[PDB]
Each structure stands twice: as structure tokens, then as C-alpha cells.
């Protein structure tokens, strides 16, 4: 098991890529899957040691380039939108 | 009470329509201009707001 | 001048008490956006 890293998994019902952060809420004994307000999988139960892990996508935002303009400079600044870094 | 702006959202087809598949990206080449226009409209909306 | 100042202070207190008792214009501009986003996610299913 690898946690806090962007990995792919197949937890018997889905094929989602994301990190597995340690949770703070306990599930019911017969709950195997999780759900939120939207129709996106956000929680799942590990069948090994009955551990609850969160789901978080890693691809956030895009790439923004800052340019001083023409006839002024030649170097640019690279900005990422909404990712931790 | 008078609102002046609201939430700024940016949506791209490469993350919404297609997930982690390559066939969807190949099939979206025929509709790439549509997504370019939608992204430009959303960018202009964000800039105006 | 004292009467008008007291009237202004009482009016300010009145709008302070009335605002604490909800907003309609500021709540819709978030509610329709939330509904549109929810419909956007729901269309994926």
C-alpha cells in the first residue's frame, strides 16, 4: 500500500487515480464505498485492514505564462493555477 | 443590495469530456475548435468579471 | 444638529438590527451558479 502519492488502483468497483490520505471518520461495518454531494468517488474502504482512505485528484488547474512583452525582455515566468507546490 | 461579480470557473474538455483515455482525445480533434471557443469565452468572462 | 445626529445614529442602529434578523440579491448569484455546477457534474452520470 502506497499513501500520499498519485497512484492508480482498482478497488473492485472503479478505476480512479489519486492519493490516499489518512481519514478521520469511521465507516459503518457494511459500507464498502463512499460518496459525496456530487457523483464523484471521494472515499473508499481498504479491504486489507479495514482502513478508510480519502480520494483526491492530482491534476489541478493549468499552465500560465507571464511575458513582459515585445522589445522589453526575453525570459518568462511559469505559473501553475491551483496545485500544491 | 447590488451584486457586481460571482464565482469564476474554468472548464476544459480534456478534463471534463475525456478522462484518462486516448481515444477520446483523438475523437475530440474534430471538435477542438468548439472547445477552444468555449475556453476563450470562459476566459473572457473571467477577465470581464 | 443634535436631533439629526441622533436620528442618523438610530437609523444606523435600526439597519444594523434589521440586517442581523436574509439577503436576496447576493444569495441568488451563488445559488444559480451552484445549481449549474451541480447539473454539470450530474450530466457526467
Amino acid at each position: 500500500l502506497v499513501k500520499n502519492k498519485c497512484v492508480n488502483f482498482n478497488f473492485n468497483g472503479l478505476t480512479g487515480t489519486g492519493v490516499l490520505t489518512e481519514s478521520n471518520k469511521k465507516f459503518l461495518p457494511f459500507q464498502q464505498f463512499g460518496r459525496d454531494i456530487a457523483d464523484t468517488t471521494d472515499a473508499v474502504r481498504d479491504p486489507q485492514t479495514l482502513e478508510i482512505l480519502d480520494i483526491t485528484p492530482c491534476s489541478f488547474g493549468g499552465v500560465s505564462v507571464i511575458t513582459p512583452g515585445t522589445n522589453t525582455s526575453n525570459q518568462v515566468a511559469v505559473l501553475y493555477q491551483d496545485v500544491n507546490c | 443590495i447590488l451584486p457586481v461579480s460571482m464565482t469564476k470557473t474554468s472548464v476544459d474538455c480534456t478534463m471534463y469530456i475525456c478522462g484518462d483515455s486516448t481515444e477520446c482525445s483523438n475523437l475530440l480533434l474534430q471538435y477542438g475548435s468548439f472547445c477552444t471557443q468555449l475556453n476563450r469565452a470562459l476566459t473572457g468572462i473571467a477577465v470581464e468579471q | 444638529q443634535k436631533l439629526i445626529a441622533n436620528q442618523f445614529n438610530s437609523a444606523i442602529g435600526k439597519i444594523q438590527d434589521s440586517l442581523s434578523s436574509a439577503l436576496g440579491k447576493l444569495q441568488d448569484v451563488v445559488n444559480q451558479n451552484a445549481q449549474a455546477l451541480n447539473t454539470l457534474v450530474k450530466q457526467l452520470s
Binding site: 456530487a38 489541478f60 491551483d82 | 469564476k8 470557473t9 473571467a46 | 444569495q27
Partner: peptide, 24 residues
């Protein structure tokens, strides 16, 4: 501020405003 009160999990990112609440 207190009177008036996932969605980003499918690529629907949100851009923060240029002017923050403290600047306003």
C-alpha cells in the same frame, strides 16, 4: 459576511479573484 454563505474533482477548477476581500 456571515449572513451569506467535490465540484473541483472533475477538472472544474475555480480561479481566485484578482482583488481579495481585504483589498475590497
Amino acid at each position: 459576511f456571515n449572513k451569506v454563505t467535490a465540484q473541483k474533482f472533475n477538472g472544474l477548477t475555480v480561479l481566485p479573484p484578482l482583488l481579495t476581500d481585504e483589498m475590497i
